[PDB]
Amino acid sequence: KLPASFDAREQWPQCPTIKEIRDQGSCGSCWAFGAVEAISDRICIHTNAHVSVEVSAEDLLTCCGSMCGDGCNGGYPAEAWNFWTRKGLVSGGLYESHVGCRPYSIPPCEHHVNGSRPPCTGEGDTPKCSKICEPGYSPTYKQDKHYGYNSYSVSNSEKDIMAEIYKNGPVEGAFSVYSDFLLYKSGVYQHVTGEMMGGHAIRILGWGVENGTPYWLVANSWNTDWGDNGFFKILRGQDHCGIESEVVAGIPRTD
Numbered sequence: 346k347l348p349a350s351f352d353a354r355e356q357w358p359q360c361p362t363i364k365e366i367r368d369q370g371s372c373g374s375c376w377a378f379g380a381v382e383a384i385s386d387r388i389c390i391h392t393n394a395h396v397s398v399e400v401s402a403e404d405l406l407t408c409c410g411s412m413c414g415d416g417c418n419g420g421y422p423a424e425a426w427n428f429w430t431r432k433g434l435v436s437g438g439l440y441e442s443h444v445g446c447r448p449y450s451i452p453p454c455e456h457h458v459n460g461s462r463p464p465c466t467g468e469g470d471t472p473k474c475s476k477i478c479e480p481g482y483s484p485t486y487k488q489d490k491h492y493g494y495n496s497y498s499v500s501n502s503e504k505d506i507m508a509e510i511y512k513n514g515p516v517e518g519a520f521s522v523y524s525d526f527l528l529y530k531s532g533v534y535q536h537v538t539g540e541m542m543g544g545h546a547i548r549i550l551g552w553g554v555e556n557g558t559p560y561w562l563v564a565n566s567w568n569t570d571w572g573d574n575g576f577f578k579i580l581r582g583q584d585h586c587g588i589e590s591e592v593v594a595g596i597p598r599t600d
């Protein structure tokens with residue numbers, strides 16, 4: 346039934362947010378980016394590319410409050426999807442993109458790689474929840490809200506997670522980062538060395554096999570010069586680093 350490989354970017358070629366890699370900046374907002382990326386993809390999938398919007402990481406980061414966690418100090422993916430069904434999320438693109446209602450306000454940075462941007466630091470104060478759209482944005486903040494029908498956990502089962510992506514689109518997941526992960530360039534990541542750094546929340550958008558090693562296709566939010574153009578592959582089928590244990594998703598409401 347299920348194909349040996351699947352790639353959401355190939356299944357939905359008219360949904361450009363699936364290909365897009367974000368940058369959370371010097372802020373611990375991975376929990377929010379995993380959600381809003383997967384939500385942006387599912388809205389485009391749900392509407393067969395008639396609605397293709399970047400949902401605002403800023404709106405979720407600043408307006409969820411204690412229910413999600415503590416903003417730029419980290420949070421909880423399951424509770425971010427719940428906020429999408431309760432208060433909804435407005436649109437907004439990348440830092441200084443002037444795209445959408447509330448584009449990201451935290452500037453980009455270099456995540457364990459060399460580049461022209463400033464290196465990422467630990468300067469994460471959560472910006473204020475400003476329920477106003479960017480000047481000149483036509484819909485009001487209320488009208489630009491996109492709502493979820495539901496949110497739910499996917500079971501810790503390889504086949505259920507694949508089936509969920511295959512039918513409903515990309516999901517949010519979470520796994521434990523060990524220090525050898527920071528140096529990922531290519532291939533299928535498997536933890537071999539280094540201490541535990543913390544939990545990280547990402548967007549899973551497919552699967553495959555590389556040199557006999559089954560993997561998940563994952564979007565990171567550390568900009569494009571990290572890893573494999575911003576994506577990585579991680580070992581699939583063994584709950585490696587907990588990758589199969591914290592998967593969450595949800596279905597958009599229409600309009």
Ligand SMILES: *[C@H](CS(=O)(=O)c1ccccc1)[C@H](CCc1ccccc1)NC(=O)[C@H](Cc1ccccc1)NC(=O)N1CCN(CCOC(=O)c2ccc(NC(=N)N)cc2)CC1
Nearest residue numbers: 373375376414418419420467469519522542543544545546
């Ligand atoms: C995104 C992952 S990441 O930024 O790319 C990263 C990867 C490796 C190492 C460090 C960061 C965020 C990062 C949060 C964070 C945690 C500690 C220090 C800095 C940043 N990760 C999360 O949001 C995860 C999501 C998750 C949920 C469930 C299962 C797995 C993963 N949540 C998380 O880590 N939490 C929950 C919220 N907590 C908030 C409490 O805040 C703090 O204690 C805190 C103190 C100090 C800092 N440092 C700075 N502000 N510079 C951050 C947070 C924390 C734990």
